Ligand binder design. Structure first.
Ligand code: CL
Length: 129
C-alpha cells in the first residue's frame, strides 16, 4: 500500500509514535518518505547481502528473519515479509524497539541525512490528527 502523507501520519499517531522516545510525528513521517516513499512494499538490498523492508526500511541483518541473511539476528521476532503489509503494526512495533536501542533515530541513515535538523513538522502540516 502507498500511503498518503496525512493518512500515514494518522496511522502512526494511532499506533503511539507521536513523541515516542521524544521524536515528534513529523520525524517519523519524514523518515518514511525518504526510506520508502510511503510504500509498505519497498525493499532494498544492502552491500552486506542484507535487505531492508517496508515503510521504514528495517534491516534483516538485525531485526527480522528473511531466511537469506547468514549470521543475522531477528530481534523483532518477525518474518521480514510482515514489514511489507498494508497493516503497519509490525513495522511500528519493530521501529519502537529500534529507536529504543541507544542511537535513537540515527539508526535510520536517511533520517540523519535528510530529516535531522530540518523543519520536520512540515510533514504533518494540514493534517487532521
Ligand atoms: Cl534519542
Amino acid at each position: 500500500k502507498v500511503f498518503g502523507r496525512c493518512e500515514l501520519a494518522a496511522a502512526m499517531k494511532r499506533h503511539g509514535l507521536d513523541n515516542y522516545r521524544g521524536y515528534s510525528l513529523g520525524n517519523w513521517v519524514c523518515a518514511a518518505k525518504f526510506e520508502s516513499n510511503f510504500n509498505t512494499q519497498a525493499t532494498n538490498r544492502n552491500t552486506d547481502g542484507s535487505t531492508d523492508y517496508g515503510i521504514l526500511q528495517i534491516n534483516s541483518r538485525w531485526w527480522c528473519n528473511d531466511g537469506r541473511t547468514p549470521g543475522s539476528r531477528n530481534l523483532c521476532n518477525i518474518p521480514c515479509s510482515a514489514l511489507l503489509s498494508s497493516d503497519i503494526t509490525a513495522s511500528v512495533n519493530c521501529a519502537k524497539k529500534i529507536v529504543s536501542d541507544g542511537n535513537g533515530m540515527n539508526a535510520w541513515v536517511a533520517w540523519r541525512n535528510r530529516c535531522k535538523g530540518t523543519d520536520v513538522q512540515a510533514w504533518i502540516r494540514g493534517c487532521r490528527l
